[PDB]
Design an enzyme around this catalytic site. Structure first.
Site, PDB file in Angstrom:
ATOM      1  N   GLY A 140      50.812 -71.831 -61.813  1.00 22.62           N
ATOM      2  CA  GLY A 140      50.013 -70.807 -61.121  1.00 22.62           C
ATOM      3  C   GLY A 140      50.596 -69.420 -61.261  1.00 22.62           C
ATOM      4  CG  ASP A 174      46.185 -66.798 -55.699  1.00 21.19           C
ATOM      5  OD1 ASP A 174      45.085 -67.095 -56.224  1.00 21.19           O
ATOM      6  OD2 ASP A 174      47.280 -67.077 -56.255  1.00 21.19           O
ATOM      7  CG  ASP A 175      48.270 -62.345 -55.898  1.00 18.76           C
ATOM      8  OD1 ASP A 175      48.559 -62.380 -54.677  1.00 18.76           O
ATOM      9  OD2 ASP A 175      49.085 -62.631 -56.814  1.00 18.76           O
ATOM     10  CD1 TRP A 196      52.804 -71.201 -54.705  1.00 16.59           C
ATOM     11  CD2 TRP A 196      50.645 -71.646 -55.107  1.00 16.59           C
ATOM     12  NE1 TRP A 196      52.433 -70.533 -55.841  1.00 16.59           N
ATOM     13  CE2 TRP A 196      51.112 -70.762 -56.096  1.00 16.59           C
ATOM     14  CE3 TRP A 196      49.303 -72.053 -55.140  1.00 16.59           C
ATOM     15  CZ2 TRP A 196      50.295 -70.274 -57.120  1.00 16.59           C
ATOM     16  CZ3 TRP A 196      48.486 -71.569 -56.176  1.00 16.59           C
ATOM     17  CH2 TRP A 196      48.988 -70.692 -57.151  1.00 16.59           C
ATOM     18  CG  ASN A 218      55.460 -68.678 -55.046  1.00 23.69           C
ATOM     19  OD1 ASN A 218      54.929 -69.076 -56.101  1.00 23.69           O
ATOM     20  ND2 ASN A 218      54.763 -68.145 -54.045  1.00 23.69           N
TER      21      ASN A 218
END
Ligand SMILES: *CCC(=O)Nc1nc(OCC)c2ccccc2n1
Ligand SMILES: CCNC1=N[C@@H]2[C@@H](O)[C@H](O)[C@@H](CO)O[C@@H]2S1
Ligand SMILES: [Ca+2]
Length: 688
Positions: A132, A239-240, A334, A336
């Site tokens: 991702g 996301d983002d 998730w 990172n």
């Protein structure tokens, strides 16, 4: 050691020979992917009606009726037993039988097995990897290899979502993959099925999604095309992004529509997952209902992803409680790490740690977002697999070593030696750091404390530093020539070169410290200067990515020790022999004189810049900052945020534009000097 470690294990300290002659019960009724592993393990041995009984099946099969009370009643559970008379490999369900066989394979050593009894199952339901990240997506070959690796470590989840894939994200998420990429995705799916991994295909439509019938239908049609390629699990990521796509009601409604109209109409869809726009605590609006709206509206079978208290963070009991109260379900994490898409000049090869090991019941799933270096990420991925299967027994250090020994059996010590000093991220905007070089740090600190102040350093400390640099070079050279995992070595090579150079520099600097005579010192000093230049050349020619170009290694402890020791010993030499040797630590071919100013220049791709300052700045009475490059270049532009020449003396002015951001193109004008003096960042871009 068995990885991941089983929930329950009883060992007897007898051992038994894998049967030369055996009798197989359940080959035609157990998971075919399990039976295949078993027959590879048994090839060259005789299948016959007499001899040792091996029984393989799932609960319900005839083959394992006798053992049904032993089989854990847990999804992906199994019972495994080895004794003198028989072997039993029995799943609660088909995936459980496959996992039985992955444990079996690790028990078998030199044609022998321990007498053992095991009952096992995962503590976290969904365990795996989300590709991702931003940057170069994994190659097709890298992905084939990943999927087999997941199977061996009982990871059941691969979520496909590379940010730079145009068919996953902006702009072409509406289009089907072209023939070539589609046939590759179809092959990934087959291989994922054979290794008992759910291939979850994600879509990232939110930057230009319209909340209308047309885009809803195109999203379903894309999903439908992915269903045709074999995909049975799906995700939608928000996301983002900014704008209309961030609306939580619309997100929930879309997900709910996909559930009712697609996931509930097909016979065989497994996961359905979303990632939210506010995906960590520090980014969620307090005066806001984003997360409670998702929590309330999203159908209860739909998962919601979460990174922790920050974009990059480790998962705590308080943090997971905080999000679970709002989204009304256990969060699907998730995580990172080891993702390096924001510190692309570093490799993160350290252990996996920081996550609470008592919160398995509070998470639906746990996946790691890895580096763009696929083989390199296997160290963390193996560790996450161990964590998420059996967190209560999770041993960071031991799992790290086990991983290294699995990934590179032929040179595991050398790989460990490289990874110990390639763990930290350096300073970054997310504030996230990792331990590095912790074994030598004590000796490093003592040596430097003494040396700066005036006292004698301990001789054992000096030898520990020498030991280290010698060992570093051994590992570099061995690693570079290793052919057991060529793809790994190709990934790490630029950093292996830089690490060798760091070690060579370190040795020469310690010889400066021993400082026999004047001309020995000077030979060593010149050798250091040349190694500094070599490090610069690797930093400008390797890993020239558009975000953080170059190659940094052993940054936490080793490079600062060497840099500070060189500076110190050069100063003492200047004092002693009344000389003027340059004490600077990083080679820089351009020069920058000023009145104001001890900011080192940096080179990044075709940009020459001054390092952003802190002590806010004193500037008056015609004071100047002059940069001289090492040659004349065509100028592209200058950008400054609070005059030119090729000659030195012959100047021409430039007029800057204004947006709070001062900046002027130089339309390929020859430039070697750049000067600024008081009026009304600091980056020259040139042609390279
Ligand atoms: C150079 C970064 C890149 O490849 N693209 C990209 N990166 C980031 O952040 C990387 C850490 C990003 C954030 C938000 C939106 C777009 C982005 N693009
Ligand atoms: C649900 C979390 N989604 C996220 N999206 C981004 C990822 O694509 C990046 O790789 C990561 C680190 O740079 O930062 C965020 S975390
Ligand atoms: Ca069966």
């Amino acid at each position: 050691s068995l990885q991941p470690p089983p929930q329950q294990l009883i060992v007897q300290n007898k051992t038994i020979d894998l049967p030369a002659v055996y009798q197989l019960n359940g080959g035609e009724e157990a998971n075919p992917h399990a039976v295949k592993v078993l027959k590879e393990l048994l090839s060259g041995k005789q299948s016959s009606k007499k001899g040792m009984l091996i029984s393989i099946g799932e609960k319900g099969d005839k083959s394992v009726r006798k053992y049904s009370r032993q089989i854990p009643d847990h999804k992906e559970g199994y019972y495994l037993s080895v004794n003198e008379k028989e072997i039993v490999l029995a799943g609660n369900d088909e995936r459980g039988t496959y996992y039985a066989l992955q444990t079996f394979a690790q028990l078998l050593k030199d044609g022998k097995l321990p007498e053992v009894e095991i009952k096992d199952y995962p503590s976290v339901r969904y365990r795996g990897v989300v590709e991702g990240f931003y940057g170069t997506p994994w190659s097709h070959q890298a992905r084939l290899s990943q999927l087999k690796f997941y199977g061996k470590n009982k990871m059941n989840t691969y979520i496909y979502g590379p940010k730079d894939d145009p068919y996953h994200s902006a702009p072409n998420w509406r289009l089907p993959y072209p023939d070539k990429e589609a046939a590759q995705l179809q092959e990934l799916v087959a291989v994922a099925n054979e290794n008992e991994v759910d291939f979850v295909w994600a879509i990232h439509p939110g930057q230009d999604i319209k909340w209308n019938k047309e885009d809803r239908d195109l999203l379903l049609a894309k999903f439908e095309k992915m269903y045709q390629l074999g995909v049975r699990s799906f995700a939608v990521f928000f996301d983002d992004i900014s704008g209309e796509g961030t609306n939580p009601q619309k997100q929930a409604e879309l997900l709910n529509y996909i559930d009712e109209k697609f996931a509930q109409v097909k016979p065989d869809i497994n996961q359905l997952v979303m990632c939210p726009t506010e995906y960590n605590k520090s980014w969620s609006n307090p005066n806001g209902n984003y997360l409670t709206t998702l929590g309330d509206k999203l159908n209860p079978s739909i998962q919601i992803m979460w990174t922790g208290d920050r974009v990059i963070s480790d998962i705590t009991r308080d943090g997971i409680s905080w999000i679970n109260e709002r989204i009304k379900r256990p969060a699907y994490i998730w995580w990172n790490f080891p993702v390096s898409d924001y510190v692309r000049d570093h490799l993160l090869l350290g252990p996996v740690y920081g996550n609470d090991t008592t919160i398995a019941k509070e998470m639906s799933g746990f996946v790691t977002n890895p580096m763009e270096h696929a083989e390199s990420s296997k160290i963390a991925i193996y560790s996450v697999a161990s964590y998420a299967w059996n967190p209560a027994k999770y041993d960071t250090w031991q799992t790290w070593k086990d991983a290294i020994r699995t990934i590179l059996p032929s040179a595991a010590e050398e790989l460990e030696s490289f990874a110990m000093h390639n763990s930290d991220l350096g300073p970054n905007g997310h504030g996230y750091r990792r331990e590095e070089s912790m074994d030598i740090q004590p000796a490093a600190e003592r040596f430097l404390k003494a040396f700066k102040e005036g006292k004698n350093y301990d001789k054992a400390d000096f030898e520990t530093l020498q030991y280290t640099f010698e060992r570093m070079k051994e590992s570099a050279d061995i690693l570079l020539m290793n052919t057991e995992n060529k793809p790994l070595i190709v990934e790490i090579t630029p950093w292996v070169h830089q690490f060798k150079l760091t070690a060579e520099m370190g040795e020469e600097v310690l010889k400066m410290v021993e400082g026999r005579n004047e001309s020995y010192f000077l030979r060593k000093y010149n050798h250091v200067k040349a190694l500094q230049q070599q490090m610069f050349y690797i930093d400008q020619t390797s890993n020239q990515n558009p975000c953080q170009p170059g190659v940094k290694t052993a940054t936490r402890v080793i490079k600062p020790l060497i840099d500070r020791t060189f500076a110190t010993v050069v100063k003492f030499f200047n004092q002693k022999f009344n000389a003027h040797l340059d004490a600077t630590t990083d080679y820089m071919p351009h020069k920058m004189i000023s009145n104001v100013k001890n900011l080192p220049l940096q080179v990044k791709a075709n940009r020459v810049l001054i390092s952003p300052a802190n002590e806010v700045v004193k500037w008056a009475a015609g004071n100047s900052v002059e940069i001289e490059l090492d040659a004349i270049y065509p100028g592209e532009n200058i950008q400054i945020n609070f005059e030119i020449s090729t000659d030195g003396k012959e100047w021409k002015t430039v007029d800057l534009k204004q947006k709070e951001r001062l900046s002027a193109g130089l339309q390929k004008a020859p430039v070697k000097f750049v000067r600024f003096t008081n009026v009304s960042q600091f980056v020259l871009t040139i042609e390279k």
